[PDB]
Amino acid sequence: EVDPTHFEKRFLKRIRDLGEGHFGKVELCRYDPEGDNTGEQVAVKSLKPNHIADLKKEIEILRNLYHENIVKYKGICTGNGIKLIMEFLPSGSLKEYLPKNKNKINLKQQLKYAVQICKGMDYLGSRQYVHRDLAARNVLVESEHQVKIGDFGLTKAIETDKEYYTVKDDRDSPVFWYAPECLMQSKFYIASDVWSFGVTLHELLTYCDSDSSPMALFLKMIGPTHGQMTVTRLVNTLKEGKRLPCPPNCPDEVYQLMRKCWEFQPSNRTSFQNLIEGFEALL
């Protein structure tokens, strides 16, 4: 019998590199058994040359997630060493899509994408998981009307009888998408992911312009060349009460909901289900 989720490594042939996430690297590949370039194009995540247990945990997370605004698990490709086979969204991430499609995508469509991310993140949060990496580069574009969350490499399960995941390894962390308690105390909540959405929402409203990215804007405020002290400087700036400014051609009613995602203490911060009600009211 043939398992459809069991992808043989020999048939799987590469096309291009799509992205790389700390240790795992994601490559576009054509799975073509018959050998005439008629095969299905699939996204193929695998380890950069261990973090096999981390990838195996990521695989088992994604396999059991079923949601419209979350990327589809297609299968696995297994000597040891394992590869995660996902569906291929050709339009790509918001980082690549939004700059190239400013004419098609308007504020009304941007808020629809924003709701769809929250619906994916609320589904994720309700299943006792914490994402730890919500940024525009990880938000994929299925079509002009649909977006999906297309990476779960830093996704971890919230522990037993506790409201946060105690972070151990944090070498390459997106510090400019991270809330103060993640930077300071190194313990990641669901309310932390709301902060990360707030920055993703800013990225979305700015059409993922590199000149006005979160990294670029924070570096303009705190200082461009401080290196090792950058993160402690970044906290001290957020302690004073200095947030990312309102994007150009962004309403205050949108920006105020974005500001509610960046309240200092997580206990008095807005949630995803609350944000859906906020955006839909404007729609």
Ligand SMILES: Cc1n[nH]c2[nH]c(=O)cc([C@H]3CC[C@H](CC#N)CC3)c12
């Ligand atoms: C899955 C995935 N399926 N289809 C796609 N098309 C893309 O252009 C990019 C991707 C992904 C490539 C890997 C990055 C990881 C990061 N940071 C997320 C985005 C995918």
